[PDB]
Amino acid sequence: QNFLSDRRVIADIVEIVSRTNGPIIEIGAGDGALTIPLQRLARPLTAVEVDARRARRLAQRTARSAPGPASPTEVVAADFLRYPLPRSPHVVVGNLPFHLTTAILRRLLHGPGWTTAVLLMQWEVARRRAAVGGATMMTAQWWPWFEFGLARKVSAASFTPRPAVDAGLLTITRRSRPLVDVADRARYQALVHRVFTGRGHGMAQILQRLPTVPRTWLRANGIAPNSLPRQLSAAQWAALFEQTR
């Protein structure tokens, strides 16, 4: 949709991806703005492009710049939302269509194997996922399993055609030691939803009006009674879940 035309952003993404290890899967491969540079990292690479005609053209481009038939990126003409991710370690890299960002993020967050994701998306979504100015409900809902980092802002002028809003480069890393067991994910995410939408002014007031916490719990866990849900850390949410489960 909005193809990346700024080579400096390509350099920045390749720099981040170069510090990771293992196979790479790229979403929204387009004409190969990131695929060709990632292929030069000499690691196994799969490039996913939903437009079959464009994917056929990309397969010719990757093959031409590859060492040769004996040594080789796999180009897949598929919708990433239907693409089965391997259960083995890999890194995901993508330039996401802005209207599909939340759906692709949910697909990845529920998916297996990937240890790092490097994703280009809307600046406002990337800021919220990385908890800039505080966490949002969706960020806190996934924090026991993943960490999020805002690598850089990317102007709408870095794409052709230009999108209506600016973009952000977001990194996501799968925690090797989850803070909450994956089997308790639904119950954990429901608790987070309940606190972010509960009535009351400050954590002390919100936790009193919920159907689940000792009077001494907040301050014992380093939480100011007037604090907002967006100010809690991942460890504090995991401790609240352990307390109310």
Numbering used by the authors: 13 to 83, 85 to 225, 227 to 259
Give the text the authors published on this PDB structure.
Erythromycin resistance methyltransferases (Erms) confer resistance to macrolide, lincosamide, and streptogramin antibiotics in Gram-positive bacteria and mycobacteria. Using SAM as a cofactor, Erms transfer a methyl group to adenosine at position 2058 (A2058) in the ∼3000 nucleotide-long 23S ribosomal RNA. This subtle posttranscriptional modification blocks the antibiotic-binding site in the ribosomal peptide exit tunnel. Erm38 features at its N-terminal catalytic domain the classic Rossmann fold, an α/β sandwich that contains the SAM cofactor-binding site and a helical C-terminal domain.
Here, we present crystal structures of Erm38 from Mycobacterium smegmatis in apoprotein and cofactor-bound forms. Erm38 comprises 386 amino acids (NCBI WP_063844518; Uniport Q79N53), with analysis using the Database of Disordered Protein Predictions predicting that the N-terminal 12 residues and C-terminal 124 residues are disordered regions. We therefore expressed a truncated version of Erm38 spanning residues 13 to 261. This truncated Erm38, referred to as Erm38 throughout, has a molecular mass of 30 kDa and a size similar to most Erms from Gram-positive bacteria. The highly purified Erm38 formed square plate crystals that diffracted to a maximum resolution of 1.9 Å and tolerated up to 20% dimethylsulfoxide, which makes them suitable for ligand-soaking experiments. The electrostatic potential of Erm38 includes a highly positively charged region that comprises residues R119, R140, R141, R142, and K166 located at the protein surface. As these solvent-exposed basic residues are likely to be involved in binding the RNA substrate, we produced an alanine mutant for each site and compared the enzymatic activities of the mutant and WT enzymes. The E61K, R119A, R140A, and R141A mutations resulted in >90% reduction in methylation activity, whereas the R142A mutation resulted in 75% loss of enzymatic activity. One reason for the paucity of information about Erm-RNA structures is the adventitious precipitation of the Erm–RNA complex when the 32-mer RNA substrate is mixed with the apoprotein.
